[PDB]
Design a protein around this ligand. Structure first.
Ligand SMILES: Cc1cc2nc3c(=O)[nH]c(=O)nc-3n(C[C@H](O)[C@H](O)[C@H](O)COP(=O)(O)OP(=O)(O)OC[C@H]3O[C@@H](n4cnc5c(N)ncnc54)[C@H](O)[C@@H]3O)c2cc1C
Length: 296
């Protein structure tokens, strides 16, 4: 009855207390040295035992006794690789991890537990993997659907997963001949994630893939305003709106919890011009599986 690729979905094969123990193959900082906060791309071995699809997540159990004397609870991460993985052997999973480092209003430099465990992982070391988890951020069954994707920072992950299966891979029962559109919002150029891969896709399928970046510190619009994901979206407002009125249009949103706000601000302008209340309409879209959000 569903409109998304949930044919034989596997959810929760591995549990938090009995997780799959994998090993780190690769792990690379994919952001410039001058960027605000480092992000790492890491590839894990699964020997094919974690049957995830595009847009799912895996939980990681970080090594260590916690500040009470018991094992850490898991932390969820969107799967940054495709079903068949970065190597295409269907034996790997990949993650897009921001190293959480902040300084608290008590003066101390605080390092987030799991993200630092992940960004400090060496090839060969063991990683505890759970899941996979998720059903909300699955690809649309329809290979001719309009797939609008909006991400900020590590929130790019499920879209990288999406797009790899769309343009980088050949599949018998899937031949993408729709329109895929990515809006990726970051602060600096050095904070761009996977730009190279996306660029390659654009010139490989100019008819089927559209790519807009939004670099808030370095870019500006006609009113001289900072380029956030919605500021860039605004530039195609009337066009984006038109696609949303179509029943084969699937929107996905992923990243910082705050991102959801500005987009709505832009969507009010749009829908009001056509006499519709956006918040009211969003509900129709959600229940029709067309507006899809996973923010954190
Ligand atoms: C569905 C889902 C998908 C996700 N995908 C990704 C992903 O793809 N990539 C990624 O990097 N992360 C992703 N995350 C978030 C990921 O779980 C974080 O790495 C994790 O929540 C925090 O990392 P940690 O365990 O290192 O920090 P923790 O040790 O758990 O500490 C986090 C806590 O620190 C506090 N805190 C955080 N920042 C500040 C601050 N600036 N000032 C004061 N206090 C603060 C908050 O209370 C927060 O709960 C995802 C989360 C979800 C729910």
């Amino acid at each position: 009855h569903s409109k998304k690729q949930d044919e034989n979905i596997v959810v929760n094969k591995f549990k938090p207390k009995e997780p799959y123990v994998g090993r780190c193959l690769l792990n690379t900082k994919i952001t410039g040295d001058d960027a605000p906060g480092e992000t790492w791309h890491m590839v894990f071995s699964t020997e094919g035992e974690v049957p995830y699809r595009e847009g799912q997540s895996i939980g990681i159990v970080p090594d260590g006794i916690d500040k009470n004397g018991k094992p850490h609870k898991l932390r969820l991460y969107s799967i940054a690789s495709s079903a068949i993985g970065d190597f295409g052997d269907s034996k790997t999973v990949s993650l897009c991890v921001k190293r959480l480092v902040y300084t608290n209003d008590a003066g101390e430099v605080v390092k987030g537990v799991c993200s630092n465990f992940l960004c400090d992982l060496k090839p060969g070391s063991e990683v505890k993997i759970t899941g996979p988890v998720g059903k909300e951020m699955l690809m649309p069954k329809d290979p001719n659907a309009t797939v609008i994707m909006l991400g900020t920072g590590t929130g790019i992950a499920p879209f990288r997963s999406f797009l790899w299966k769309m343009f980088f891979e050949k599949h018998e029962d899937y031949q993408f001949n729709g329109l895929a559109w990515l809006f990726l919002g970051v602060p600096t150029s050095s904070s761009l994630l996977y730009k190279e891969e996306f660029e390659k896709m654009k010139e490989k399928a100019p008819e089927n893939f559209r790519l807009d970046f939004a670099v808030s510190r370095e870019q500006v619009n006609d009113k001289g305003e900072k380029m956030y994901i919605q500021t860039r979206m605004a530039q195609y407002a009337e066009e984006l709106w038109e696609l949303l009125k179509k029943d084969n249009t699937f929107v996905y949103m992923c990243g910082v919890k705050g991102m959801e706000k500005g987009i709505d601000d832009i969507m009010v302008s749009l829908a009001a011009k056509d006499g519709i209340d956006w918040i009211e309409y969003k509900r129709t879209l959600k229940k029709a599986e067309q507006w899809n959000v996973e923010v954190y």
